[PDB]
Design a protein around this ligand. Structure first.
Ligand SMILES: O=C(N[C@@H](Cn1ccnc1)c1ccc(-c2ccc(F)cc2)cc1Cl)c1ccc(-c2nnc(-c3cc(F)cc(-c4ncncc4F)c3)o2)cc1
Ligand SMILES: O=C(N[C@@H](Cn1ccnc1)c1ccc(-c2ccc(F)cc2)cc1Cl)c1ccc(-c2nnc(-c3cc(F)cc(-c4ncncc4F)c3)o2)cc1
Ligand code: HEM
Ligand SMILES: C[C@H](CCC(=O)O)[C@H]1CC[C@H]2[C@@H]3CC[C@@H]4C[C@H](O)CC[C@]4(C)[C@@H]3C[C@H](O)[C@]12C
Ligand SMILES: C[C@H](CCC(=O)O)[C@H]1CC[C@H]2[C@@H]3CC[C@@H]4C[C@H](O)CC[C@]4(C)[C@@H]3C[C@H](O)[C@]12C
Ligand SMILES: C[C@H](CCC(=O)O)[C@H]1CC[C@H]2[C@@H]3CC[C@@H]4C[C@H](O)CC[C@]4(C)[C@@H]3C[C@H](O)[C@]12C
Ligand SMILES: C[C@H](CCC(=O)O)[C@H]1CC[C@H]2[C@@H]3CC[C@@H]4C[C@H](O)CC[C@]4(C)[C@@H]3C[C@H](O)[C@]12C
Ligand SMILES: C[C@H](CCC(=O)O)[C@H]1CC[C@H]2[C@@H]3CC[C@@H]4C[C@H](O)CC[C@]4(C)[C@@H]3C[C@H](O)[C@]12C
Ligand SMILES: C[C@H](CCC(=O)O)[C@H]1CC[C@H]2[C@@H]3CC[C@@H]4C[C@H](O)CC[C@]4(C)[C@@H]3C[C@H](O)[C@]12C
Length: 445
């Protein structure tokens, strides 16, 4: 029962924290070459064991939450933002129930309603961009994504209350997701903390009103909000006003930053490979018609090249770079026994560009999925939405959203790099943002 190899700390307490913080990918890539798929190292006195490659990563994804726990690591950051009675503030079984309730809401019935809602929001927002110019796509996409997601996931009522004030409250909640948050004690009266806690109560209060309103209302509506109001547990109890508010927050936060960054990154991949962008525009005609009519849900499924362009983006710029668990009990993989207390980590980013399993691993060639490839070839080579009991329930809504917006965007504009600059990765944010993400655009044909 041998432990995995341990990369000895160069610095006593800090370990490899400095080195990791600059280029964590590069770090993990070197770590693989020199130590193999299973190894342990230290940052700020905490031991992490990393599982690189499908075979190893399998351990994390296959595991029960009893054994490799997600709350043990996530609870302290989420509970203060999402709120009580939801996500990691409850046993995993209760979460898995809440996940079904959320999942049911995300069906073909609602995906149809959404496409038109998202197309409309997309056209109306990109009025302000004029006929051409140079503007930050990321800033723009983030602002658009919150409105779409709120309209779609919350409803028109709650979407109608979305003034720039409420936008800044949603940012103040997101400020709750910081390196400071998990590095420093919660009892430090930090601005970011206090703005999170303030923004929480104020947003809960907004949802409390909108929920009461809907329940009283004779009004029957088939949207996600109602899915949750009507839904029940296995016991037969329905959700509380607070449980619902909690999940409405999680929904929006989940939706926004994952999609916005992903959307922003593609926009620069497409801006670099003009050949591919052209095909992506001509696909729109070829699938929807030469007249470019209002997008419908069933048209989405036929957008193979766009779908593959997204897939290829999440491969190279997955928004959630690392998923990690607390080891509660021993866990064996590749002849190694990970002891309790270790923080077991997996990297979609590393797994999705491993030289040994990826031909031309740095390249953005979305056609790599039209032959044998690790996505369909390997179990856990491709996991931008994860796997097992903690896997994403928002994979479909995400694609719907990213397709519709960019479908509408391609139709509206042609995009290009500025002096042939391609954004490098800014590792300083929680979700890695593109360094200087301003793009050149102009009216399409
Ligand atoms: O950094 C601390 N603890 C963790 C870090 N942490 C805690 C929560 N989140 C992060 C910590 C503490 C030590 C180590 C560590 C690991 C490996 C090493 F080789 C050395 C230290 C690793 C960690 Cl993670 C920390 C640990 C201990 C103290 C602390 N606790 N008690 C003391 C202390 C100080 C004193 F002046 C006296 C005494 C003391 N205690 C009992 N009786 C009489 C006494 F005088 C205790 O210091 C203050 C901070
Ligand atoms: O972004 C998170 N959760 C999201 C994930 N998401 C987004 C879309 N799909 C999944 C999240 C997860 C669930 C939900 C949600 C929404 C509605 C619901 F009804 C239910 C869930 C919403 C969101 Cl935004 C998230 C949750 C927890 C953490 C976290 N907590 N602790 C840490 C942490 C702790 C550490 F000790 C170290 C580190 C750490 N981080 C980077 N580098 C090195 C490190 F050591 C991070 O990270 C970080 C991120
Ligand atoms: C690009 C878009 C998205 C990506 C890449 C993404 C990625 C992920 C990943 C990797 C996980 C696994 C987390 C882990 O293993 O610890 C996850 C979990 C989850 N995601 Fe997403 N997600 C996206 C969008 C969404 C959306 C739109 C929603 C809801 C509307 C959502 C809701 C969730 C939920 C509820 C979980 C479960 C967390 C858990 O069980 O611990 N996600 N997502
Ligand atoms: C290692 C994480 C980054 C994790 C990530 O990249 O996702 C970062 C987040 C906070 C960073 C800490 C900030 C406080 C310190 C900043 C100093 O200038 C040198 C690094 C120190 C001692 C820490 C080192 C390390 O750089 C940390 C712990
Ligand atoms: C000791 C100073 C106070 C000195 C002063 O303010 O002049 C305090 C203030 C901020 C504290 C730092 C917080 C970041 C880090 C928290 C980690 O858990 C490991 C200890 C670190 C690396 C530092 C611990 C140390 O206790 C510091 C540096
Ligand atoms: C207590 C942790 C040490 C990290 C840890 O052990 O978890 C660190 C993080 C921030 C540190 C604080 C720094 C500012 C505070 C005033 C002084 O300028 C230093 C002492 C105080 C009252 C705190 C001292 C203490 O050392 C703290 C709270
Ligand atoms: C380091 C933590 C707080 C930061 C953290 O939670 O990480 C601080 C906050 C409360 C501090 C305790 C105060 C009571 C005690 C004070 C004594 O004179 C000797 C240390 C003791 C036993 C503890 C010292 C230690 O420094 C603690 C535990
Ligand atoms: C900040 C720490 C613990 C961390 C926290 O939860 O904030 C708090 C918790 C209990 C507090 C201690 C209790 C005895 C002391 C008198 C008060 O009866 C409370 C504050 C004093 C001065 C101590 C210092 C510090 O205020 C402590 C140790
Ligand atoms: C959080 C601890 C003790 C826990 C508590 O507040 O109950 C408190 C006790 C004393 C607090 C510090 C006192 C001076 C600082 C300015 C204010 O003149 C008082 C709060 C500030 C901002 C600091 C906040 C910091 O967090 C401390 C050290």
């Amino acid at each position: 029962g041998k432990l995995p190899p341990y990369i000895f700390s160069p610095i006593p307490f800090l370990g490899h924290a400095i080195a990791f913080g600059k280029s964590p990918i590069e770090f993990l890539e070197n770590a693989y070459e020199k130590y193999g798929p299973v190894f342990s190292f230290t940052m700020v006195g905490k031991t992490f064991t990393y599982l690189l490659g499908s075979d190893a990563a399998a351990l994390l994804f296959n595991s029960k939450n009893e054994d490799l726990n997600a709350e043990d690591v996530y609870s302290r950051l989420t509970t203060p933002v999402f709120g009580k009675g939801v996500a990691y503030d409850v046993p995993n079984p209760v979460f898995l129930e809440q996940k079904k309730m959320l999942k049911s809401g995300l069906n073909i019935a609602h995906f149809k309603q959404h496409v038109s809602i998202i197309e409309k929001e997309t056209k109306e927002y990109f009025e302000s961009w004029g006929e051409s110019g140079e503007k930050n796509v990321f800033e723009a996409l983030s602002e658009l994504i919150i409105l779409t997601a709120s309209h779609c996931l919350h409803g028109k009522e709650i979407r109608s209350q979305l003034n720039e004030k409420v936008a800044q409250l949603y940012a103040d909640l997101d400020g709750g997701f910081s390196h400071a948050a998990w590095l420093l004690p919660g009892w430090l009266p930090l601005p970011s903390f206090r703005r999170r806690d303030r923004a929480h109560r104020e947003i809960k209060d907004i949802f409390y009103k909108a929920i009461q309103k809907r329940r009283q209302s004779q009004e029957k509506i088939d949207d996600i909000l109602q899915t949750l109001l009507d839904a029940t547990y296995k016991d037969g109890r329905p959700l509380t006003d607070d449980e619902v508010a909690g999940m409405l927050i999680g929904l929006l936060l989940a939706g926004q930053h994952t999609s916005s960054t992903t959307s922003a990154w593609m926009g620069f991949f497409l801006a670099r490979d003009k050949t591919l962008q052209k095909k992506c525009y001509l696909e729109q005609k070829t699938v929807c018609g030469e007249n470019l009519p209002p997008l419908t849900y069933d048209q989405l499924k036929d957008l193979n090249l766009l779908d593959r362009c997204i897939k290829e983006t999440l491969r190279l710029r997955p928004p959630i770079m690392i998923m990690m668990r607390m080891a509660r009990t021993p866990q064996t993989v590749a002849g190694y026994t990970i002891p309790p207390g270790h923080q077991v980590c997996v990297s979609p980013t590393v797994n999705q560009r491993l030289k040994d399993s990826w031909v031309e691993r740095l390249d953005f060639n979305p056609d790599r999925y039209l032959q044998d490839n690790p996505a369909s070839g390997e179990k856990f080579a491709y996991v931008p939405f994860g796997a097992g009991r903690h896997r994403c329930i928002g994979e479909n809504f995400a694609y719907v959203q990213i397709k519709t917006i960019w479908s509408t965007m391609l139709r509206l504009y042609e995009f290009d790099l500025i002096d042939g600059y391609f954004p490098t990765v800014n590792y300083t944010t929680m979700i890695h943002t593109p360094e200087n993400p301003v793009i050149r655009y102009k009216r399409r044909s």
